[PDB]
Amino acid sequence: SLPKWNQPSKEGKKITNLFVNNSLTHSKVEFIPQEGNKIKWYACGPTVYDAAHLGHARTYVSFDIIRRILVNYFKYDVFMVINITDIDDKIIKRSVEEKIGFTELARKWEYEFWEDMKSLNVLLPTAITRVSEYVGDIVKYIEKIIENKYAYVSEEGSVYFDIDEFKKSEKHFYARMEPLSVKKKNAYDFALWKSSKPNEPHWDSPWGKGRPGWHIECSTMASNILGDVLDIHSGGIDLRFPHHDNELAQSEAFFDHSQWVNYFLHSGHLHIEGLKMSKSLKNFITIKNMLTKYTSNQIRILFLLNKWDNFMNYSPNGESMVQCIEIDKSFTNFFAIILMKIKNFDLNSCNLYWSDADNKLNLLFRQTKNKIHEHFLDNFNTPDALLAIQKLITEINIYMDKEKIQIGLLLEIKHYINFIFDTFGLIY
């Protein structure tokens, strides 16, 4: 009555001693690639029917940071895929009210979403998959689930996942990450294919005209590009159930195996004034509106200060952003001085003896490098790594103001801090 997780074998794999909070094990576990240093990563993407707000930014910026740590810092080989849900009930409903076509609405808000991501310096994934371009692939995916006896077709033409048949199999467990949250055979069964009314958009299928169900999209596209095993699957914690648990059931049924994803990472909720940021609650702040008050670096520092997997509470009116603006100011001033000193330094006039002051700054510099390395291994502890950089910057500023300058030491410190800020997504 308990789900089981199998860790990848270490032989032949890049091992960093990295530990990540995995929602499958509900614990921190060592991260081991399925193959060598490669990481196959699928991330759930936006439903392009409206603007993105700060909550969305929290997920996409937080996992953008984690990706930068994995690639830039640990030198993993990351293959990332994000879907665009351009077919949806919300897209259909908004398109009729606006009296614009479904595809025209979806492409407009898809465009604004990628513009907003670029404004926050979120790297684009390796592959972008639209649901509208994979409808035929979704049908074939559903056909195989039916062939495996894990799906049934209703009279109206819909197709439903058969949870009961899925559970009976010993190899398969349903609702791994949220076990307690759990005309059809069973109420808890969900639709792989929805029979479309004549007034709704539809696609031809063996079972009749219809639309893809909520969850089938991600399982189809991720399996086609990445295959039977995914190293990482990311998303917001809200998507954990029923969305992601249903992705696992669909892909396990399709491949008839036990583990579709080795590591499931979930970003914490963003609450504004104690309630989750939601369009329905009307407490949302769009990414564009946030950018008219704050810079991209400041917004990224906000998410660096709140651990990616933890709960976060945003205080509006700039209460939470006050610290972010102070840190951004400290980084900006530090880079100004160190860059000017490196540029203007004159070797002939200076004395290049290696003094105790030089040795002390050098020892703290190597010490800070190790502190940050432990923090990144500690489930991407960016808040403490950011504090480590600040402590180092305080001592470098003292050294630049008073001590005689070892130009090479400062140049090497600048290269490191630039390397860490590229890992954070900061641009100075």
Between 90 and 209, CB nearer to Cl ion: 90
Mask 93-112, x = binds a second copy (CB under 8 A)? --------------x--xx-
d(CA 99, CA 244): 33
Give the nearest distance from C-beta 98 to a second copy in angstroms. 16
b/e for 139-154, b at 16 or more Cβ within 10 A? bebbbebbebebbbbb
Question: Tokens 């992705």 appear where?
Answer: 247
Work out which of 13, 38, 271, 414 binds a second copy, going by CB under 8 A: 38
Which tokens in the block code for residue 320? 């939470």
Q: Does 42 bind a second copy (CB under 8 A)?
A: no
Beta carbons of 13 and 35 less than 8 angstroms apart: yes
Work out which of 241, 264, 303, 334 binds Na ion, going by CB under 5 A: 241
The helix or strand, by DSSP H or E, that contains position 157, with its residue range, turns out to be none
Residues numbered 190 to 229 that lie near a second copy (CB under 8 A) are 224-225
**Listed residue (283, 270, 218) closest to 245, CA to CA:** 218
Q: Does 9 bind a second copy (CB under 8 A)?
A: no
Q: Does 264 bind Na ion (CB under 5 A)?
A: no
Between 249 and 377, CB nearer to a second copy: 377
d(CA 324, CA 228): 41
C-alpha Rg value of the chain to the nearest Å: 25
> Following CA atoms 408, 413, 415, 417 in sequence, which dihedral angle do they give, to the nearest 10 degrees?
-170
Q: Does 125 bind a second copy (CB under 8 A)?
A: yes
Between 84 and 385, CB nearer to Zn ion: 84
The entry of Zn ion, Na ion, a second copy, none that residue 44 binds, CB within 5 to 8 Å by partner kind: Zn ion
Give the nearest distance from C-beta 20 to a second copy in angstroms. 19
Which residues are near Cl ion by CB under 5 A? 44, 46, 52, 59, 235-236
The number of residues that bind a second copy (CB under 8 A) is 45
Between 293 and 366, CB nearer to a second copy: 366
Which residues are near Zn ion by CB under 5 A? 44, 218
Which tokens in the block code for residue 292? 């008219």
The entry of Zn ion, a second copy, Na ion, none that residue 241 binds, CB within 5 to 8 Å by partner kind: Na ion
Q: What is the DSSP string of 190-254?
A: -EEEEEPPTTS--B--TT-SEEE-TTHHHHHHHHHHH-S-EEEEEEEGGGGTTHHHHHHHHHHHH
Beta carbons of 32 and 71 less than 8 angstroms apart: no
Question: β-strand 230-236 against 38-43: which pairing, if any?
Answer: parallel
Question: β-strand 27-30 against 38-43: which pairing, if any?
Answer: unpaired
Between 177 and 302, CB nearer to Zn ion: 177
Mask 355-384, x = binds a second copy (CB under 8 A)? ---xx--x---x--xx--------------
Work out which of 51, 123, 229, 285 binds a second copy, going by CB under 8 A: 123
The entry of a second copy, Cl ion, Zn ion, none that residue 372 binds, CB within 5 to 8 Å by partner kind: none
Give the nearest distance from C-beta 343 to Zn ion in angstroms. 30
Q: Does 121 bind a second copy (CB under 8 A)?
A: no
Residues 6+ apart with CB under 8 A from 209: 157, 195, 196, 202, 203
Where along the sequence are the contacts to Na ion (CB under 5 A)?
Answer: 238, 241
Where along the sequence are the contacts to a second copy (CB under 8 A)?
Answer: 36, 38, 71, 73, 75, 77, 79-81, 84, 107, 110-111, 114, 123-130, 133-134, 224-225, 347-348, 351-354, 358-359, 362, 366, 369-370, 406-409, 411-412, 415
